[PDB]
Write a protein that binds this ligand. Structure first.
Ligand SMILES: NC(=O)C1=CN([C@@H]2O[C@H](COP(=O)(O)OP(=O)(O)OC[C@H]3O[C@@H](n4cnc5c(N)ncnc54)[C@H](OP(=O)(O)O)[C@@H]3O)[C@@H](O)[C@H]2O)C=CC1
Length: 337
């Protein structure tokens, strides 16, 4: 197997120097285990945090160890378990060609699943994140105003479309005119505001004439600063991500606003709740899968995928992913099936 290992921990934004490409002898499938060969590899913003050694919900990637991530693989070794040579499976083998496994995969067998790569997006972790965060924490009611940034991304597009079918007025936030116009034309968003526009806060306040009832937080920073004075009484904030600060080297200057945010949550009676989808939500995944399969069949969910070819290109893609260079859920094709 070839491999993308972490050469050095990045300073600010990650560079191509922080990664390295290396071959390794990948055999020993053994008895009781299996050898998986990857076809697709997901790239996700959380991986940035895994490059830094700051105290976090998970262990950082060790120097010269494989970079982590969910993959869609095929079995190529006779598993002694209940999986055959050919069964497609959603695994977590990282940025490499081969790995050895023995639970807990998810059979998409195979070897003829319809859209196996969808297991990394709309039917996988990002769609599940959007589903759970919006429905269980945001708890949308008819007439609620829903605002989400990174609106054409893996999680944001799903948040917006689910909110639309749940009776929300959905205000998107994205970077650049093309993404906002795609969010309106194809994803069904009522509005979509360019956060790169100089008068972004004023545009947001203008289209949010009735306030914000749910803010699905994906970005933080300037976007949340513009959102705060528009929050309604009883608003809900599913705290999903804060990508605007993933490359931050220090805290912003100026006076400490922590007590200010706490006073706002108190005065406006707001629920702000962080969540990590990788926690045990096994009791909800079946409901999510049934609902999302139905909504996809009904034509209420458009899933945009950004497929880039070549595992050797996986670093650069990831870097671009952090700057909004992606259009949709970023996936790298590592091998032909
Ligand atoms: N809590 C959980 O368990 C999970 C959390 N997440 C979080 O959800 C968020 C998005 O996930 P995903 O949809 O996969 O990523 P995307 O597929 O949305 O791509 C990331 C997007 O972030 C946006 N972005 C990056 N920097 C900035 C910035 N400084 N200001 C505004 N927007 C920015 C860009 O969209 P644009 O071009 O519009 O700026 C970029 O395309 C991330 O924060 C991620 O960490 C993801 C999965 C699960």
């Amino acid at each position: 197997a070839r491999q993308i290992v972490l050469a050095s921990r990045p300073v600010g934004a990650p560079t191509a120097e922080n990664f390295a490409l290396t071959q390794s002898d990948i055999p020993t499938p053994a008895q009781g285990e299996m050898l998986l060969r990857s076809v697709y590899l997901s790239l996700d913003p959380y991986m940035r945090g895994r490059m830094s050694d700051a105290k976090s919900y998970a262990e950082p990637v060790g120097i010269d160890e494989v970079m982590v991530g969910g993959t869609v693989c095929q079995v190529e070794a006779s598993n002694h378990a209940e999986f055959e040579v050919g069964e497609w499976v959603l695994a977590y083998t990282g940025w490499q060609d081969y790995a050895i496994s023995d639970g807990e995969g998810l059979i998409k067998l195979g070897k003829q699943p319809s859209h196996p790569s969808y297991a990394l997006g709309v039917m996988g972790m990002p769609g599940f994140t959007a589903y759970m965060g919006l429905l269980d924490i945001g708890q949308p009611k008819e007439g609620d105003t829903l605002v989400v940034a990174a609106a054409t991304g893996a999680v944001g597009s799903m948040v917006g479309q689910i909110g639309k079918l749940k009776g929300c007025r959905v205000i998107g936030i994205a970077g650049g005119e093309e993404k906002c116009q795609f969010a309106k034309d194809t994803l069904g968003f009522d509005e979509c505001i360019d956060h790169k526009a100089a008068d972004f806060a004023e545009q947001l306040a203008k289209v949010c004439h009735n306030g914000i009832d749910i803010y699905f937080e994906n970005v933080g920073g300037k976007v949340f600063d513009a959102v705060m004075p528009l929050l309604n009484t009883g608003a809900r904030i599913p705290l999903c991500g804060l990508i605007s600060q993933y490359n931050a080297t220090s805290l912003p200057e100026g006076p400490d606003r922590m007590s200010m945010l706490m006073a706002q949550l108190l005065i406006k009676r707001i629920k702000m709740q962080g969540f990590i989808i990788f926690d045990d939500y096994g009791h909800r995944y079946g409901e999510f899968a049934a609902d999302m399969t139905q909504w996809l069949a009904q034509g209420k969910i458009h899933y945009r995928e950004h497929l880039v070819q070549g595992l050797e290109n996986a670093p650069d893609a990831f870097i671009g992913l952090l700057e909004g260079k992606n259009f949709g859920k970023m996936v790298v094709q590592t091998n032909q099936p």
